[PDB]
Amino acid sequence: DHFLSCYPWFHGPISRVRAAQLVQLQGPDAHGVFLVRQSESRRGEYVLTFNLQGRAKHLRLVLTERGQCRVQHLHFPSVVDMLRHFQRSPIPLECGAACDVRLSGYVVVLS
């Protein structure tokens, strides 16, 4: 978790509620804004918290020892590459093209 500290979108061990309010603060116009945080309920893991039409969603991220980022059926070399992928392709949800959501900006850590 210390190695992700260089990135301005990594918030570390902030709470789910704090993270949800950070990305919801600007409302539905902030659709796509995200941050990354450590998971507070499944310690060792990480979470991508993003804004989806004003609502906060939480996607789990698993990091290998080598830094690879696994997101369920998706694998990426890094969380950065995971982020860049979702900036270009919609997060795959059941509603498909009806709920197109790509990552836009990010909440800068309050440091």
Partner: peptide, 8 residues
């Protein structure tokens, strides 16, 4: 609580 991704 946590979001589930779906494959085609």
């Amino acid at each position: 609580k946590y979001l589930y991704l779906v494959v085609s």
